[PDB]
From a paper:
Here, we carried out a deeper characterization of FC-531, studying its interaction with CA IX and evaluating its anti-tumor potential in parallel with SLC-0111. In vitro, FC-531 displayed high inhibition potencies for the transmembrane and tumor-associated isoforms CA IX and CA XII (i.e. KIs = 6.2 nM and 2.3 nM, respectively), in line with those obtained for the reference compound SLC-0111 (i.e. KIs = 45.1 nM and 4.5 nM, respectively). The binding mode of FC-531 was assessed in complex with hCAs II and IX by means of X-ray crystallography. Superposition of the 2 structures clearly showed an almost complete matching of the ligand bindings, the main differences in binding interactions being spotted at the upper part of the enzymatic cleft being the Phe131 residue mainly responsible for pushing the inhibitor away with beneficial effects for the key interaction among the ligand ureidic oxygen with the Val131 residue.
Human (h) Carbonic Anhydrases (CA) are zinc metalloenzymes that reversibly catalyse the hydration of CO2 to bicarbonate and protons. Among all CAs, the IX has emerged as a tumor-associated cell-surface CA isoform mainly induced by hypoxia and involved in the adaptation of tumor cells to acidosis. In tumor cells, its enzymatic activity contributes to the balancing of the cellular pH gradient allowing the generation of an acidic extracellular pH (pHe) and a slightly more alkaline intracellular/cytosolic pH (pHi), and this has been associated to increased cancer cells invasion and metastasis as well as to induction of stem-like features, drug resistance and recurrence. Among the ureido-substituted benzenesulfonamides class that included SLC-0111, a structurally related compound, here named FC-531 (4-CF3C6H4) was originally synthesized and displayed high activity for inhibiting CA IX.
Residue numbers in the entry: 1 to 125, 127 to 261
Write the structure that this text describes.
């Protein structure tokens, strides 16, 4: 609540700049996507999402989200095309969500907040490892996908099923043989802009690719997210909800759209 960065009144996003002054930088994320200002760019290529050989490893409650990690030693699950130059390897995905269904997303669309947001995090292979990539202005690409409540997303259910085994900070479980293709919406139409990580260290090295089409997840799926805990085992129970950073100033940036 004050012993480490987080999302509460005493350690949340308004405090982060003290340890990470780039929090007040020129290319911070998330942002509000004003759909009427975004520019259709007919020269953007279709996004290429190649996840058929993805090799998942573990699922972890890291005290700020839950995250599924992948083997990124080789080009297995990669993102290419769109605004990207070269090849970006999938490292991990995680979510941000709310306490109620009208908040939880980091990006907004014409100020609209979604119930949650999925981030599929990739790094640029030209830098050899993620640690080096994190120091570059084009080191990372994050594919952001909004979640709204509707019918269940079948490809999310194996994630939901394991959450009770990682309730508290520091717990992990085996999470091999998970196929992230099951998390995507039908359309790959997107907005893109240059930004940052949305958690410390807030590094300004991300090409954001935010899909226009949300996925629908069921009420029961989101309720299971909201049973996770921020705290470690034995500490006062603080439900892991509202683990989202609000929109940051756009400053000197243009958001581009892949679609008219
Ligand atoms: N919310 S967001 O999508 O903007 C976002 C925020 C923070 C990160 N940070 C990392 O993935 N860091 C990282 C992972 C993994 C490793 C490894 F263990 F592999 F070296 C070393 C660093 C990514 C994305
Ligand atoms: Cl604390
Ligand atoms: Zn994220």
């Amino acid at each position: 609540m004050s012993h480490h960065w987080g999302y509460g009144k005493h350690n949340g996003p308004e405090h982060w700049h003290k340890d990470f002054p780039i929090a007040k930088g020129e290319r911070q994320s998330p942002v509000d996507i004003d759909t009427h200002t975004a520019k259709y760019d007919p020269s953007l290529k279709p996004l290429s999402v190649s996840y058929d050989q993805a090799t998942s490893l573990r699922i972890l409650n890291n005290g700020h989200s839950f995250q599924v990690t992948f083997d990124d030693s080789q080009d297995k699950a990669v993102l290419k095309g769109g605004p990207l130059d070269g090849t970006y390897r999938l490292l991990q995905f995680h979510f941000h969500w709310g306490s109620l269904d009208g908040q939880g997303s980091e990006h907004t669309v014409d100020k609209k907040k979604y119930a949650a947001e999925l981030h599929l995090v990739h790094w640029n292979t030209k830098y050899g490892d993620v640690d080096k990539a994190l120091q570059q202005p084009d080191g990372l690409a994050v594919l952001g996908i909004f979640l709204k409540v509707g019918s269940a997303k079948p490809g999310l259910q194996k994630v939901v099923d394991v959450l009770d085994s990682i309730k508290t900070e520091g717990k992990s479980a085996d999470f091999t043989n998970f196929d992230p293709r099951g998390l995507l919406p039908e359309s790959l139409d997107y907005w893109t802009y240059p930004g940052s990580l949305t958690t410390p260290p807030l590094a300004e090295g991300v090409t954001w690719i935010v899909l226009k089409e949300p996925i629908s997840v069921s009420s029961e799926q989101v309720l299971k997210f909201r049973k996770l805990n921020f705290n470690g085992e034995g500490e006062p129970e603080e439900l892991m909800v509202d683990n989202w950073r609000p929109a940051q100033p756009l400053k000197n940036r243009q958001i581009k759209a892949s679609f008219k």
